[PDB]
Amino acid sequence: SIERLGYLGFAVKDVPAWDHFLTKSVGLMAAGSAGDAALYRADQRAWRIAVQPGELDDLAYAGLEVDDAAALERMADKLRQAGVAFTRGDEALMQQRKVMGLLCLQDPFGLPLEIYYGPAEIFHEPFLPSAPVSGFVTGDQGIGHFVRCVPDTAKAMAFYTEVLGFVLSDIIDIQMGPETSVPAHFLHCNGRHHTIALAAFPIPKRIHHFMLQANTIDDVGYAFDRLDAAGRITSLLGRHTNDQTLSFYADTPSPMIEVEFGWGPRTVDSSWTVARHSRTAMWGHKSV
Amino acid sequence: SIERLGYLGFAVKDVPAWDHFLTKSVGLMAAGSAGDAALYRADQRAWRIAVQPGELDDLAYAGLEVDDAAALERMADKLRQAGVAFTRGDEALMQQRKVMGLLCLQDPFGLPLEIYYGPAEIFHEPFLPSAPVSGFVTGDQGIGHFVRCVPDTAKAMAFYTEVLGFVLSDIIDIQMGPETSVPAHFLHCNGRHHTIALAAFPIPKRIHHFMLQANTIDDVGYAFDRLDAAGRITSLLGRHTNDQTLSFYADTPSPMIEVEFGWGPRTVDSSWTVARHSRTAMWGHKSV
Amino acid sequence: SIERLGYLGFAVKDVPAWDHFLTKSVGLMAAGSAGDAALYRADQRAWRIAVQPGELDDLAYAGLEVDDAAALERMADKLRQAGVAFTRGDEALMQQRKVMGLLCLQDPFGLPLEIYYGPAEIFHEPFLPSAPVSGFVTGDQGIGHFVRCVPDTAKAMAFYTEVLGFVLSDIIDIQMGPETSVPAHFLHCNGRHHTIALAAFPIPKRIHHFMLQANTIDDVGYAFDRLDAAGRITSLLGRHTNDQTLSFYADTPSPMIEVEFGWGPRTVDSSWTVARHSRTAMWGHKSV
Amino acid sequence: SIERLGYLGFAVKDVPAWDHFLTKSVGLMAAGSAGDAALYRADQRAWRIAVQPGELDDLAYAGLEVDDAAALERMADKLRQAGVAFTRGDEALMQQRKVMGLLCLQDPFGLPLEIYYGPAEIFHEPFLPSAPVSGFVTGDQGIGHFVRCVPDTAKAMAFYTEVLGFVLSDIIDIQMGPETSVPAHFLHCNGRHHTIALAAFPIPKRIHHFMLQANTIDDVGYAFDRLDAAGRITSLLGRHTNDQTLSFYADTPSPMIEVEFGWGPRTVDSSWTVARHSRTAMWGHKSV
Amino acid sequence: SIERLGYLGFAVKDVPAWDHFLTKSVGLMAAGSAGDAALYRADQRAWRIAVQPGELDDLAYAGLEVDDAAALERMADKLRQAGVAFTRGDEALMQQRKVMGLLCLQDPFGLPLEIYYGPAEIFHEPFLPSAPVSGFVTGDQGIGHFVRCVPDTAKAMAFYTEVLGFVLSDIIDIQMGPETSVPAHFLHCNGRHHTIALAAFPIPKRIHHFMLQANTIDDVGYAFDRLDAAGRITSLLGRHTNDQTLSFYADTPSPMIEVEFGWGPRTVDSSWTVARHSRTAMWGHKSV
Amino acid sequence: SIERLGYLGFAVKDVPAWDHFLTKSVGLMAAGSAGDAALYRADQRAWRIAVQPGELDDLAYAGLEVDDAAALERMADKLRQAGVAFTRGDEALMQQRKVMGLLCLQDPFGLPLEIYYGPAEIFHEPFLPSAPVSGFVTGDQGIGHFVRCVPDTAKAMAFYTEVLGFVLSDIIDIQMGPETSVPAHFLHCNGRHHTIALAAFPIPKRIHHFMLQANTIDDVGYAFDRLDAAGRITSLLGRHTNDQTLSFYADTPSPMIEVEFGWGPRTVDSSWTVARHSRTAMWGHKSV
């Protein structure tokens, strides 16, 4: 099974706006480039987010990490047994992503996924944020989460759980209109309450948002003010019902894709109990 | 196996007396209604205790929780293999109990049991006690315990352990008369020393009492005074020999059914050793 | 100023009943005799309570401790300056009380007080309780407290505070009848919330009770059952409003003198704020 | 496998001397009798050591505890499979030992062993030591250890490990004469570094000693002085090389059987590494 | 699988220089001799490093520890199944190495390995360093690590992982020349991040260095000055990218073999993720 | 007032025996010489104990430390005001003792005292014990204590308290014969329960013993065995009634002067209460 979400690549219409957004607003460290992709760091990894030019204005790929070469081969076996098509990343791709091995596939609705092992770390170039942020919570919990839009949640659930080994944490009926809600399914693959959530939202993007977790409440408060100065805030500060992350949401430069910046959630383990919630926020998160 | 006791439903002759008892005396939060049942909360769950009108003046059903849908299906398999009749709760029942799935059955002596997963939580409506109580100990240990009256303890033991997966903690020979005792069997299914105890008592009720565990010793002391003002106390403060819960007992409005309100027990795990005790109280619990 | 209450001597009509009471019920260690006084230990001190025959059936003297010889001389100076009569204990008295020096005086209403330093300790004869009690809280807080009955609380307050150096913690209006209360004044001289309380009670004794503090809640619970078996309980378990001691009261063999046996209070310091309370118990302590 | 050593029974020529020894010297609580056996407590168990009259002046039986009835049946299966004779204790024996079930057998060299479950606990009669000892370390580690004398250590090892499930901790070559040593094998069955040790000593007793572990270093120091006053000391204070228990040894009233009274060892788990030691004491334990 | 590295034996041209180096510079305790080998201690073990005369000026053997006799037999089975030649150490060898059993074999490139159990400990002769060092970190992590030079890292990896049970922690591309690096593979067999590393270095020695871990940063700082006074320093203080050990390197008296003396690394477990690093030092370690 | 005891100088008939005793038995570090005095270290100070040849076979001087130059001048003022003769140590003496300033005087019975400030520390030559001892407890508590023999304890008390600023901790009536005891007075000048004790013993030495405090109980146990091998033990292990130091006593090479080697006492402060004890040992310390 997948151990954690390790990296995200975006294909965007405004690379300079994304550069400013990720550095001056979010606080990530600029880390050069690989091919036509600008790279950004959040920790010791050589990169965590890549931004390349493209008309998609969307998530172009997600990197799903396993712990060693044998684990990668076991994932290849799982894909074969499930009848899921995949190819082995060639040397050029391995060098581009800075990994020792990877499998390239797509989820049932077209999102490219890369299962990899052996990422590059550069502790001799210690992390230096571009904006005041004390650090990010990554480690065994990976880079953060994203909310994946899908046309058929049952079909998506079968793939992410049965093939990739994610596990359902809980469900929230997210209120859309007066008498309409969407049942969002929150999945874990480590202690992070959710790494991927699935929801049948009526938006034209592969994801609704990606989320980064900062070390302190002040990191979140300060980031809110930076994103507010940029005119990007989409939610007030709030705390989620299911994972108790205290966060806010803001627009990225790609229309309809947001970022969530948060702190302080609960973590999970083998004893997590599936439950259902009728709201996304225990408090706050008013849309603005 | 069952993971924890999640909810209790009572059918009672005096619904207003039970309402006052559960709120002003015990401290639970009134939480509206579902059908003809008044609902009461002790924590983040949408409800923990339900009270409906009925001549039984007794426990009408107990909700036994599992962690996910697959676990529920495994319980259905266990029931099938054991030859225990059950039905799947329909949509109306699921909506009434606020659960994602449930199996309806009875124990060997007629107590309706509901095995369920995916209960509703409402963190956006934070718990507010109706009387001064700092909170209840629930979580992975479930709502509390009850002592089930049975005509044949061996038969009841076989069902609760072999079919439902409870595990014997210990036995107390409860003194009844001069030369008479009843061997009460205390069973766990999580860290709570007992979730269900079985005893062959000569009372005309399905249960002897249900128990709630408060967060502090003062919660217990204050509750004693409230129940004393109500004229309901049946035991002085005391501490049990087996789980070291410090509690008192009081009458509910249903004759012969008591409530226990306690604090501070030991918890159990895979290393618990079966032992036998000759008294229910290490100290206190004098009957009044 | 007085540093702590160190010892108590009783003159009683039934020495054997007091012996049984202090050992088998309370748990103190029998420690031989000095003259016609039977001695009892609670800790490393050679003795803490003395019981001698006498018709008083009351507290015969209280030992008030200071830390060294110079402190004793300063107390002699305070007594002289205040015009309070005193004598210096002679060699025989010093040997009887096992102290290096002492001043003998009375409070304004006739209770003999002994101010002393240099008590005997016998760590080579480690404490061994006579009943199941894990130990007592003594140390810098002294042996416990007593509630002193006085005809004029203002006069008593002036003596205990201005002459002896006690400090007011708080006041409780203790309900006596329908429209009658007595303002009990609780005084400290160390971290123990009260060492002496003063009250104008209509009883024919020098004290209402003396109190010992045990190390654990179970010590208190077990002691309650022992005193109940002896037919001596006068209050149910409860917790005080002012010091948050969790205790019960019981009769000693001397009519109208009780003992309090408790656990777990708050302690005080230079920042304690005088406040007023309308009840002695936050919960419990129902009289029986 | 055996979970812990639970009880010991001795058959002795001088029952009064053993009574005084176990109470006034060691500190155990006298706990009545069962049949012709005097009982002694160290904790919440109804009894831990039994003393009956007999010419053996030796260990008459050892009680080996398992956690439940099913575990006892699994032990019966192991005995059957190994060809080890055993009988099931009858009702009279169960009542005598205060257990819910037991198997009676002998080790290869004649020591009666009793494998049992469901011992009696009496928390309503809290432990009260007969001499100043703060308490004993028992719990999941059982009552202590004994060193079993055997004529063939390999044969004894095969039985205790393969049949009963004990596990070798380490070996000490115990110096006997100038060029002679005995390889003592120390076995665990829980966190206690050793519960049984095997050694081919030239003594005419079934055991060399039994050992009790007290809670504090002072407990050990005080006990040394009591046993010295009794003229029973056989070793000065010392600390063992293998388990780092700080203890002393003394004679029991049965010739050639000693007691060890100790504190503060290391505990073990699945990661313990077998090692060999050339001395029993890292320091101390000089024979006197 | 191998549990830890337990001992190292060197065959050297200058035994007195090695003696001075290990004692006065490194701080090990001289511990007599066994045959023609001088022995040195770092802890409770009778010996950890042996130095014998020989023209090799290299590591002569490495002792790989398992926890018990059965584990040794399982290793013999693994060797047999893998077609790896081995012999059982005879009594003379067992006595020389002070072990209860051992298997003698070589790795694929000629380094003698000894798999053993039951080493001698001498707690009655407590460790006394020869130079100011507070102690070494050994225990379950073994004596330290060594970096093994091999002509074919893949072949060496297959042996150390598949046969001996070591597990890959991570890889560092160690820069050699302008456009040349060697991929060093770091292997664990316990919590120590690496016990053996494999690298295809162009040196004529079996190992590049061995490493000892001291308890404090000051131990490392003081040792640096001692080795500097001896003219042996080869690296400044630094900290590694992969295990975060803070250390320095120095020459041993055998040309081309160094010692590493360090403190304060991260430890590993089943959750360690394979990663790749482009530098050996996060900071420092400049070669001098 | 004096802040702590900093150093001791002995004048002895057998300098080599004292050298072996202090290093191989006690564990102190040899630290060269100053004039005709051999120096020994216990910590970062350039020296703590000096040994010079002399027929006295006794303590030749004691160094009493203050914190700065102004404090030394205040001590000179106290001496002047008390009429106590003193001289200022000259440059040669300052260089010999490695201090920035000192006053030379004697106590009322002839013991030379040196009050000093600004001692030399040599952290670049870290402490290295000569025998297995983990370290000594010194710091603000100074080097240890000594018991000073005096012909008139009242006179000695007046000097040590009124002139030097020591403070009485407690008194022990030390049993000498059948109906004879000596009241030993234990004095502190920092958190060490006693730095100097005064007693009217009938011995022909200035002191009865000096004491060093080691960091661990094992340090004490191991030291006992070393001193026993040397034939010097004078007491078994024991623990004191007043300071709860766990120690043993042994003979130094100077007849009638002993050393005490201990661990783990209580410390004192402004709240210490004077008490009296009838024994020196709570347990142990049997004379041998």
Ligand SMILES: Oc1cccc(-c2ccccc2)c1O
């Ligand atoms: O991390 C999260 C936890 C709970 C809910 C959301 C969410 C809210 C609105 C739309 C989509 C998801 C979320 O992001």
Ligand SMILES: Oc1cccc(-c2ccccc2)c1O
């Ligand atoms: O929680 C508990 C623990 C031990 C005994 C009882 C009990 C006492 C009297 C009657 C029935 C049960 C209990 O409720």
Ligand SMILES: Oc1cccc(-c2ccccc2)c1O
């Ligand atoms: O310790 C105490 C704290 C508060 C009240 C009392 C008290 C109650 C009734 C009568 C007298 C005193 C007391 O004893």
Ligand SMILES: Oc1cccc(-c2ccccc2)c1O
């Ligand atoms: O607990 C123990 C640990 C180590 C050795 C012994 C021992 C010593 C002498 C004779 C027999 C055993 C022991 O009792």
Ligand SMILES: Oc1cccc(-c2ccccc2)c1O
């Ligand atoms: O412990 C270690 C951790 C990381 C790298 C090295 C290393 C550096 C240079 C040459 C060989 C190995 C090392 O020793």
Ligand SMILES: Oc1cccc(-c2ccccc2)c1O
């Ligand atoms: O540190 C100490 C504490 C208490 C007593 C002594 C003592 C015992 C015998 C003779 C002199 C002193 C001592 O040294």
Ligand SMILES: [Fe+2]
């Ligand atoms: Fe989110």
Ligand SMILES: [Fe+2]
């Ligand atoms: Fe109950």
Ligand SMILES: [Fe+2]
């Ligand atoms: Fe009171």
Ligand SMILES: [Fe+2]
């Ligand atoms: Fe033993």
Ligand SMILES: [Fe+2]
């Ligand atoms: Fe290294």
Ligand SMILES: [Fe+2]
């Ligand atoms: Fe001393």
